[PDB]
Design a protein around this ligand. Structure first.
Ligand SMILES: [Mg+2]
Ligand SMILES: [Mg+2]
Ligand SMILES: [Mg+2]
Ligand SMILES: [Mg+2]
Ligand SMILES: [Mg+2]
Ligand SMILES: [Mg+2]
Ligand SMILES: [Mg+2]
Ligand SMILES: [Mg+2]
Ligand SMILES: [Mg+2]
Ligand SMILES: [Mg+2]
Ligand SMILES: [Mg+2]
Ligand SMILES: [Mg+2]
Ligand SMILES: [Mg+2]
Ligand SMILES: [Mg+2]
Ligand SMILES: [Mg+2]
Ligand SMILES: [Mg+2]
Ligand SMILES: [Mg+2]
Ligand SMILES: [Mg+2]
Ligand SMILES: [Mg+2]
Lengths: 56, 68, 230, 121, 247
RNA sequence: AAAGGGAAUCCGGUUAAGAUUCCGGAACCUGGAUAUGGAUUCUUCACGGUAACGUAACUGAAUGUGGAGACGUCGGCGCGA
RNA sequence: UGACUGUCUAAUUAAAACAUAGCAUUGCGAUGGUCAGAAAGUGAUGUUGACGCAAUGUGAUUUCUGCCCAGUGCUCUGAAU
RNA sequence: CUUUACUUAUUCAAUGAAGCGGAGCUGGAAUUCAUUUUCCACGUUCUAGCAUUCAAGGUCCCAUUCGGGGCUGAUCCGGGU
């Protein structure tokens, strides 16, 4: 019950991974994969846009 | 005295000089509250002849009432 | 420095939450601030008559400074000076046995609306200063015409507070010199000559010119755009 | 003309100084005495057969107390008047509008001897 | 002699809406610098069911441009939007279903919904389920846009008023018969107390203009003037014609 | 809101009449103070497991996000008292 | 005879009456329709937007709804000394 | 006894009154026609990730105190949300 979380220790309310007691290890995995891949596609988009604006 | 001139000037309410001031002042009185404190009379001569002396304890309130 | 890099934030649309900018143009001001701003806006949007707007032509900065330099020589008595000269007169009355020969003739500026108006009517005022910023304007708006009528020279001058400071008030709304000492007659004549050129000799032409009618910044921009494009 | 750089489009009321009261005369200038001291709190003992069976058996002094007294005030009053140390206070408003306190003393004190010293039984 | 039932609905005692279960006022995003100059991307996180409404609502989360937080808006979901869809709202938005872009920056024949009447009132026209507004015109010299409303009415809106591309979801809802007063009961139980409707001819003459008589008839003409007063307007108010729509 | 949400108390005994309230034993919660043991620390803010995750602990302000609170009705099936 | 389930005259009428779904007509694109308020910088519909709201008639399904716009009502970019 | 122009009265609406109005770098289908007669564009579209600490950087001053304050980053003007 929600006020019983004030009584227990920190171990019981989280998992030792990032987004511990908030997200569920496949959502975190998807967030990591998406954060890696979109921030690489941003670099790819940056150099393609710089190429196309530097051609003309 | 200036209050004789204020008396005769306030009677000319449809002149240009007072017609402008009536418009410019009716806007501001409308923008203020319905009952608000006036810091000094806008007609000091009329205040004097109706009773007001410019000393402590004499107070002016401006107030608008719905016509009709 | 290999430890510091160049991030720059992309403060465009849809990226990088906007920085703190000067939003003083967009402040929801208090209602009295809005009233006192839109009042001076509304007083110049409307076509002002020529009885108002014979004001807002004010004695300019150099000749106003000369006028106040002359008028500060004739500041009236303070309370301390009044107490000092009253003790001096009480000495000459009680032991000195001098009647009204104790204190000399005072030379001071004249102030107060009824007093100054009556001096103009009796043609004793040598120079009248009229505050441009009184409220209500009806208290002094007859005074350029009265001064032109009785031939005394007037000057619509900037600051009822400035006129009050020379008479030891907070606000004086008029001031007047009715007599000066001998060393200031040339200064007063020069001042009257450079004040009459702006006020009494321009009165009959200012009496026909309506003030105001001034459009705003945006409305004037979109009006000279249409004037340029047509 | 320097203008205040306002990064907020909200005007708030400025933090003007609030002075403390420095009155020219006191509000009453004769303060009231203790409205609920120990003798106002402990009104009288309760000496029913049930309230006396609680004295020699349960180590409990039964008192009629003030209706304005809480358990802290009843404990302070019992400690101050009768020079005992109190384990517990259990109060109830009786159906005749009085208040009855069951004051359990600690085991150091015998409530029958404290009652004998007070004067009842 | 008695105040009648249509007159009693304006006091709003028992005739108020039943708005406990409703998700919020389904409105467009407020017209800001982002929506007025470029676009802003939000994300559909839920397609929820609004109570008392025949169309679903898309809970679309945007980023607040000025403060680091998330601003959740409640759109009416156009038919085709899904969860996880990026909704691009603004002048420089692209012509996709779900995007919120002004009527000036769309082509002729574009089909919009939740479209405004004035720029910035956050959705007024074509909000019920299945409804849409067709964009039949543009007038750039006066910044107007001619549109065709769901009633067939041609309306001239500003070209800066916004609209969401697509038809409102939940279409074809009225095509199914309710079949029973239970289904009508549970329909109106979450809208308002406008059901069941006693006919006025079944009433007494004190209750209604149509009431009374030894036979259930109307008596006077059912077509009532537009200039008639409150209490007389119980019939066909200001009717231009009557009878079946045949020629 | 003494029927909704909600921090935490149970058994046994007891009275002419009170008890989840008294007594005896065994708890728990909230608020506060605060010491000792442990833990962490010369890689200053722990370690193991590929991982789901584990542990007696194992810094975390503004601000943001998320969860719990927090939810219909019927039907059969499974488990428990 | 009412399609049905349902509702009502508490305390003489439970019905063939009311409601119903279905059908139809009307008004209204918000500076709006219908309806409140003595007024209001006031309200209900409306946390609404024509698959909606509001006013009526008929009263499931099947099969049909004929003629009459003279009267009365409603309505009309319409007639201009 | 006709029409359309102004905005400040009056009316409507919104917002935590945030980017309004005017003018300013490139670019061109201005054939620069020696002149921006001249218009448009104002950092964000594979993806249910993230975006916050007067901002990193560039530069100047402090009297430097292991830190602080300007300018710029983020054009100027008008305070008409
Ligand atoms: Mg104004
Ligand atoms: Mg009790
Ligand atoms: Mg109690
Ligand atoms: Mg309501
Ligand atoms: Mg009916
Ligand atoms: Mg009847
Ligand atoms: Mg409860
Ligand atoms: Mg028990
Ligand atoms: Mg009992
Ligand atoms: Mg116990
Ligand atoms: Mg240790
Ligand atoms: Mg360890
Ligand atoms: Mg029946
Ligand atoms: Mg009966
Ligand atoms: Mg019966
Ligand atoms: Mg019937
Ligand atoms: Mg039938
Ligand atoms: Mg027929
Ligand atoms: Mg704003």
């Amino acid at each position: 019950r929600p006020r019983q979380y004030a009584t227990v220790s920190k171990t019981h309310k989280t998992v030792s991974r990032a987004y511990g007691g908030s997200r569920c290890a496949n959502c975190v995995k998807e967030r990591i994969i998406r954060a890696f891949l979109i921030e690489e596609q941003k670099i790819v988009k940056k150099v393609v846009k710089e190429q196309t604006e530097a051609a003309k | 005295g200036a209050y004789k001139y204020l008396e005769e000037l306030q009677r000319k309410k449809q002149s240009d000089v007072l017609r402008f001031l009536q418009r410019v002042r009716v806007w501001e009185y409308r923008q203020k509250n319905v009952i608000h404190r006036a810091a000094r009379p806008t007609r000091p001569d009329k205040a004097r002849r109706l009773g007001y002396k410019a000393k402590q304890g004499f107070v002016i309130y401006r107030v608008r009432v719905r016509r009709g | 420095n290999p430890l510091t890099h160049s991030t720059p934030k992309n403060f465009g649309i849809g990226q990088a939450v906007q920085p703190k900018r000067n939003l003083s143009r967009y402040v929801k001001w208090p209602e009295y601030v809005r009233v006192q701003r839109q009042k001076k806006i509304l007083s110049i949007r409307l076509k002002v008559p020529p009885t108002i707007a014979q004001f807002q032509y004010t004695l300019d900065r150099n000749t106003a400074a000369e006028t106040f330099k002359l008028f500060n020589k004739y500041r009236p008595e303070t309370a301390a000076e009044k107490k000092e000269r009253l003790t001096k007169e009480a000495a000459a009355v009680a032991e000195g046995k001098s009647k009204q020969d104790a204190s000399p003739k005072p030379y001071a500026v004249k102030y107060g609306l009824n007093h100054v108006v009556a001096l103009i009517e009796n043609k004793k005022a040598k120079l009248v200063l009229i505050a441009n910023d009184v409220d209500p304007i009806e208290l002094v708006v007859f005074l350029p015409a009265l001064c032109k009528k009785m031939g005394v020279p007037y000057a619509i001058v900037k600051g009822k507070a400035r006129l009050g400071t020379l008479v030891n008030q907070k606000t004086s709304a008029v001031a007047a010199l009715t007599e000066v000492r001998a060393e200031d007659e040339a200064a007063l004549a020069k001042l009257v000559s450079t004040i009459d050129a702006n006020f009494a000799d321009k009165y009959d032409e200012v009496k026909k010119h309506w003030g105001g009618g001034i459009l705003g910044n945006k409305a004037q921009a979109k009006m000279d755009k249409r004037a340029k494009n047509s | 003309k320097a203008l205040k750089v306002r990064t907020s489009a909200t005007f708030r009321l400025p933090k003007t100084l609030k002075l403390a009261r420095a009155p020219k005369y006191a509000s009453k200038a004769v303060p009231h005495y203790n409205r609920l001291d120990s003798y106002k709190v402990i009104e009288q003992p309760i000496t029913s057969e049930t309230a006396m069976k609680k004295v020699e058996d349960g180590n409990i002094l039964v008192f009629q107390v003030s209706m304005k007294a809480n358990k802290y005030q009843i404990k302070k009053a019992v400690k101050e008047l009768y020079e005992v140390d109190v384990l517990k206070v259990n109060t109830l408003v009786r159906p005749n509008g009085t208040k009855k306190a069951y004051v359990r003393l600690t085991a150091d004190y015998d409530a029958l001897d404290i009652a004998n010293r007070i004067g009842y039984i | 002699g008695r105040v009648i039932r249509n007159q009693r609905k304006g006091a709003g005692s028992i005739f108020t809406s039943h708005t406990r279960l409703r998700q919020g006022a389904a409105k467009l995003r407020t017209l800001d610098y982002a929506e007025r100059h470029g676009y802003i991307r939000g994300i559909v996180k839920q397609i929820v069911h609004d109570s008392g409404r025949g169309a679903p609502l898309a809970k679309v989360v945007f980023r607040d441009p000025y403060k680091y937080r998330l601003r959740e808006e409640i759109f009416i979901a156009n038919e085709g939007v899904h969860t996880g869809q990026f909704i691009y709202a603004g002048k420089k938005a692209s012509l996709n279903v779900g995007n919120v872009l002004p009527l000036g920056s769309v082509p002729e024949g574009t089909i919009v919904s939740n479209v405004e009447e004035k720029p910035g009132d956050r959705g007024a026209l074509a909000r019920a389920s299945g409804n849409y507004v067709i964009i039949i015109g543009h007038n750039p010299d006066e910044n107007k846009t001619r549109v065709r409303l769901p009633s067939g009415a041609k309306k001239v809106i500003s070209s800066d008023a916004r609209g969401v591309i697509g038809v409102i979801a939940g279409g074809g809802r009225v095509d199914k018969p309710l079949l029973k007063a239970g289904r009508a009961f549970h329909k109106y139980r979450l809208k308002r107390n406008s059901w069941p409707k006693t006919r006025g001819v079944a009433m007494n003459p004190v209750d209604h203009p149509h009431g009374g008589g030894n036979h259930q008839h109307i008596g006077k003409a059912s077509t009532i003037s537009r200039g008639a007063v409150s209490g007389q307007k119980a019939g066909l108010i200001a009717a231009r014609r009557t009878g079946l729509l045949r020629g």
